[PDB]
Amino acid sequence: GLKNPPGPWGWPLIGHMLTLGKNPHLALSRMSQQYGDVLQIRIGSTPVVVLSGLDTIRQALVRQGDDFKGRPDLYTFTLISNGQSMSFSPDSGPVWAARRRLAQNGLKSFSIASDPSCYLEEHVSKEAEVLISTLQELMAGPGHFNPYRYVVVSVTNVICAICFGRRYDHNHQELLSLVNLNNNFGEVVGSGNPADFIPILRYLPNPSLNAFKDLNEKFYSFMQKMVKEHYKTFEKGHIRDITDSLIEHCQEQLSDEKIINIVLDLFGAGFDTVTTAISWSLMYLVMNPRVQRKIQEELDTVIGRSRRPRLSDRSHLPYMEAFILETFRHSSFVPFTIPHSTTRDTSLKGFYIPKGRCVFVNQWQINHDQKLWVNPSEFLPERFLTPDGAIDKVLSEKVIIFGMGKRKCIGETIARWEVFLFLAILLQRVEFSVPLGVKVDMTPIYGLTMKHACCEHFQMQLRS
Numbered sequence: 001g002l003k004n005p006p007g008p009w010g011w012p013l014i015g016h017m018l019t020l021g022k023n024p025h026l027a028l029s030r031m032s033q034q035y036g037d038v039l040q041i042r043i044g045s046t047p048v049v050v051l052s053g054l055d056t057i058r059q060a061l062v063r064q065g066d067d068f069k070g071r072p073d074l075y076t077f078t079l080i081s082n083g084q085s086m087s088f089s090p091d092s093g094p095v096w097a098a099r100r101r102l103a104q105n106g107l108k109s110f111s112i113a114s115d116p117s118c119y120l121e122e123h124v125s126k127e128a129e130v131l132i133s134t135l136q137e138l139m140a141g142p143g144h145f146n147p148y149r150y151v152v153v154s155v156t157n158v159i160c161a162i163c164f165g166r167r168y169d170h171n172h173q174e175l176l177s178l179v180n181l182n183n184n185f186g187e188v189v190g191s192g193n194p195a196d197f198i199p200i201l202r203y204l205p206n207p208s209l210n211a212f213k214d215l216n217e218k219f220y221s222f223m224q225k226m227v228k229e230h231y232k233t234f235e236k237g238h239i240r241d242i243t244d245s246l247i248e249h250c251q252e253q254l255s256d257e258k259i260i261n262i263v264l265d266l267f268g269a270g271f272d273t274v275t276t277a278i279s280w281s282l283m284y285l286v287m288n289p290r291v292q293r294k295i296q297e298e299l300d301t302v303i304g305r306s307r308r309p310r311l312s313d314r315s316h317l318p319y320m321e322a323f324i325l326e327t328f329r330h331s332s333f334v335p336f337t338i339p340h341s342t343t344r345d346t347s348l349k350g351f352y353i354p355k356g357r358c359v360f361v362n363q364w365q366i367n368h369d370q371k372l373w374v375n376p377s378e379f380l381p382e383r384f385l386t387p388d389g390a391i392d393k394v395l396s397e398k399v400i401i402f403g404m405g406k407r408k409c410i411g412e413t414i415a416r417w418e419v420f421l422f423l424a425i426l427l428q429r430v431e432f433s434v435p436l437g438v439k440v441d442m443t444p445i446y447g448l449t450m451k452h453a454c455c456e457h458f459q460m461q462l463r464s
């Protein structure tokens, strides 16, 4: 038959906003244990459908994805990339698909293809060596360092080369104001931002929204700066990065602006996400050092100690694909996808969802469903390993964090390689640790990309 999505009772004026609280991915998980995979809330006057459960989500984003491929018109998204973002604008028709395919292409052309030896491979090692040299310096003087300030540059340098052909040192000024001065949570985009549903909070004293409205103007400046320095030195046959790749196309509807700001779409996604991933990894390595050995033990068995890991080795290091798989899962640092929206009156598991309905996708619920994982709160990479030491290719596919369907991540490949290549080169020549007896807050901080309370105590050691 056909029924309306269930849900709990919400306040008439504000809705369930007082129930979501500060960690919606948790609040909405406990709901899904009561109302299931399809449930309905209201934030202010706007109703929202929260999709949970692995198979329920697969049914909507992939099989019926053409019905769920849209984005709601939220206030915060109008501020990103001049309200014309490929990823966040309400545009989802042909105009958008054209921009995605140009994005996937510019990546495959300056990320995967060979360098006249892989593009991504050459860069990651480039900044990995630098990163190591740079961390040694802090062990010399201060003795202790915060791993984030330096990982973010080293990560940013990579995505920044694939896009603008430039690299910046770890103590630059313009870049730390760009990708690090923010040193905040990233929450005004995290699904459930009250300003998107309570119109008044946009005009009231809101510094988080002022630090955010400003950080975007700064980002959109760095784009124009590079687009011009690239058009000042542009050769119609010699393409040097995704930036050049886009310019070349503006010559061949699609405003010149909706094509160029795409390189910003890759750049803002790149540095933010992969950085967090590597940061969390260090936090785990430092917290549970058995995994620090069992991941080194593999690294000294497959390849040696007089060999820098190449990108061809990710296949034959299963314990590391496990650690990656677990760090993605246990943290689930992308707990919600970017909110979706129904493109037409559709149905899911017997429920009616009308056209235009804001929908949340609770990736955090899948990665911590006790129905699937035995002990979801424990960090145990060993849960992905078959009795013969290999990766269980059906459970690794149940770790959801890049999305599904027509809107999934276009840099999943590049994120998985980059996160494995960065980790390999370090730990082979490095023993991260933290002195016993200090506070390390492993608690996550809600946001689009969840972060952690920065830690200034890490100590890198050179191996035997």
Ligand code: HEM
Residues within 6 Å of the ligand: 086, 087, 088, 100, 103, 159, 265, 266, 267, 269, 270, 273, 274, 277, 334, 336, 337, 338, 340, 361, 401, 402, 403, 404, 406, 407, 408, 409, 410, 411, 412, 414, 415
């Ligand atoms: C661990 C790292 C990463 C994670 C967890 C991640 C996750 C995601 C998620 C959950 C979405 C949206 C899902 C949805 O809309 O339903 C997304 C979209 C996107 N991602 Fe990533 N991503 C990562 C790295 C990257 C990288 C390295 C790039 C590019 C260099 C990238 C580029 C994009 C873009 C352009 C979109 C927009 C999707 C669209 O507009 O259709 N991501 N990513």
Ligand SMILES: Cn1ncc(NC(=O)c2nc(-c3c(F)cccc3F)sc2N)c1N1CC[C@@H](N)[C@H](F)CC1
Residues within 6 Å of the ligand: 080, 081, 087, 182, 183, 184, 185, 186, 187, 188, 189, 208, 211, 212, 215, 219, 264, 265, 266, 267, 268, 269, 270, 272, 273, 338, 448, 449
């Ligand atoms: C392409 N692109 N250009 C600009 C962005 N935005 C930011 O980096 C960003 N800064 C944020 C922030 C902050 F730094 C400090 C204080 C408060 C804040 F709110 S919140 C957010 N989203 C993006 N993406 C985001 C990452 C990825 N996961 C997406 F899926 C796709 C693209």
